């Protein structure tokens, strides 16, 4: 059966208003051996990212003459979901890795390090929708932690349409039953979209509304990212946009 996505009072299945972010928790430099690391948590989506700083390439001809080669990997641990996800990478996992890589390529100043590869490894520890965004942000921060210079930090939310209501930051449930799921990532200071996807259905209007809301969310997240950079540790109890 279908669960009701916006309850009689105007709150969602987890009791959030249409414009409220899930609880965010960020910490940097958590892994000894990585050059940069970060754990990111939005609600129940938990990702860890490790970065291996600019180094030359083992296969010589595969390097780039003026650029760093970004090597990115989005992967879901078998116990991140309600039923054991298979470790061997899925088509979904492959697409996401590319979408994320490209996202990062627009932020990282890859020209600074020719002939070098920068490894970005990402693991989802619990999936609860928007796993790809938690992953990307974890990466962005892990890169920053690694001291690798980028244009800006990357911040992102999944925005969507529930019971005809446009909602911010989706549930596992909301991803599953809602009309639309639209991940958006930004370099907020530059007002630059880095990742943008929609699956589902929207009128051009709804599209533009959800879009406006996604920004407001992203900005709040971006501030916590700045904070995580300074103090190495950030917690945020859920709040309205």
């Amino acid at each position: 059966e279908r669960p009701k996505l916006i309850l009689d009072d105007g709150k969602r299945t987890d009791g959030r208003k249409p414009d409220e972010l899930r609880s965010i928790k960020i910490e940097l430099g958590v892994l000894k051996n990585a050059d940069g690391s970060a754990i990111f948590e939005m609600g129940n989506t938990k990702a860890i990212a490790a970065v291996y700083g600019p180094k030359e390439m083992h296969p010589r001809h595969l390097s780039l003459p003026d650029r760093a080669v970004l090597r990115v990997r989005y992967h879901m641990t078998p116990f991140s979901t309600d039923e054991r996800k298979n470790p061997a990478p899925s088509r979904r996992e492959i697409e996401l890795s590319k979408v994320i890589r490209e996202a990062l390529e627009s932020a990282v100043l890859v020209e600074l390090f020719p002939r070098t590869a920068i490894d970005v490894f990402t693991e989802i520890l619990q999936a609860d929708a928007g796993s790809r965004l938690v992953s990307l942000m974890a990466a962005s921060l892990a890169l920053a932690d690694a001291g690798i210079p980028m244009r800006d930090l990357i911040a992102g939310v999944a925005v969507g349409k529930a019971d005809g209501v446009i909602i911010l930051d989706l549930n596992e449930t909301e991803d599953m039953w809602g009309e639309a799921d639209m991940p958006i990532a930004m370099m907020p200071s530059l007002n630059q979209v880095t990742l943008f996807q929609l699956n589902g259905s929207m009128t051009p209007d709804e599209f533009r509304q959800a879009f406006d809301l996604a920004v407001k969310g992203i900005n709040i997240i971006y501030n916590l990212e700045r904070e995580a950079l300074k103090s190495k540790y950030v917690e945020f109890k859920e709040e309205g946009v």
Partner: protein, 271 residues
């Protein structure tokens, strides 16, 4: 693991300006306006041994899509639905530098993007593909083969796919066995779907980027539309970024193009 393509061509600084200086005058190399589509040819029922097939030429890009129907037990997860398996293949023959043997990163990305705009739009009604509920349903194999890489492959795949499906013949179902020369009808299709790609080059936006245009663009964004102009899929693509208002206009343009393309697609299919 995903990594920056080492092989895709680094097109010089100089060549880029040439194209941009033209964009500044609202024209491109091939002659078309910034919002124009390349010439479109569709030849239906091209692969004879397919259930339905379509050969699409969008400019110099060539895609051949073909369907093949099979009877399967539906997935234990979704017991009241036929299955759809879209399968883009980027056979080397498309471009001067490709790897062969079942798909990679972009092939997969293309497939999933085409999949999602067919599935999420319910352009093809999967609930109408049930033979024996829970026991046996139709599995629709869509196989999309890119033969010539002319740039903007995504749009040409959407087209080849939609066309192949509309060309698809369903067969008689002997109760146990399929009978492949008593044609029963057509696929349960609600309506066609188009995907329109807009490339951001410099400060300009460009509809249906060609090979050169793709190699110099910052990024591109693709919009899937149903006939009544509901957005039914979006995909940003490329290693660069795009502003907020960029995307706003992109969709504006993508949409008022979608109308024109949809009519033309229907003409090839016969209303």
């Amino acid at each position: 693991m995903s990594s920056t393509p080492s092989n895709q061509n680094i097109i010089p600084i100089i060549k880029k300006e040439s194209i941009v200086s033209l964009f500044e005058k609202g024209i491109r190399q091939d002659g078309r306006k910034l919002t124009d589509y390349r010439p479109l040819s569709i030849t239906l029922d091209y692969a004879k041994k397919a259930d339905g097939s379509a050969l699409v030429k969008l400019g110099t890009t060539m895609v051949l899509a073909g369907t093949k129907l099979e009877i399967d037990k539906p997935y234990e997860d979704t017991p009241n639905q036929g299955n759809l398996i879209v399968n883009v293949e980027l056979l080397p023959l498309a471009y001067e530098t490709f790897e062969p043997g079942p798909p990679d990163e972009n092939a997969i990305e293309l497939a999933r993007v085409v999949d999602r705009s067919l599935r999420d739009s319910k352009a093809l009604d999967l609930t109408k593909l049930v033979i024996e509920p829970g026991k046996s349903v139709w599995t629709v194999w869509l196989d999309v083969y890119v033969l010539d890489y002319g740039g903007n492959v995504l749009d040409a795949c959407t087209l080849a796919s939609v066309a192949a499906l509309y060309n698809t013949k369903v067969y008689k179902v002997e109760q146990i066995s399929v009978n492949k020369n008593e044609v029963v009808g057509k696929l349960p299709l609600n309506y066609p779907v188009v995907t329109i790609s807009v490339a951001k080059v410099d400060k300009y936006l460009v509809v249906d980027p060609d090979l050169d245009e793709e190699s110099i663009m910052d990024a591109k964004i693709s919009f899937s539309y149903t006939p009544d102009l509901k957005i039914v899929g979006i995909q940003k693509s490329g290693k660069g970024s795009m502003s907020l208002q960029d995307i706003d206009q992109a969709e504006n343009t993508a949409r008022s193009t979608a109308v024109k393309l949809l009519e033309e697609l229907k003409k090839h299919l016969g209303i």
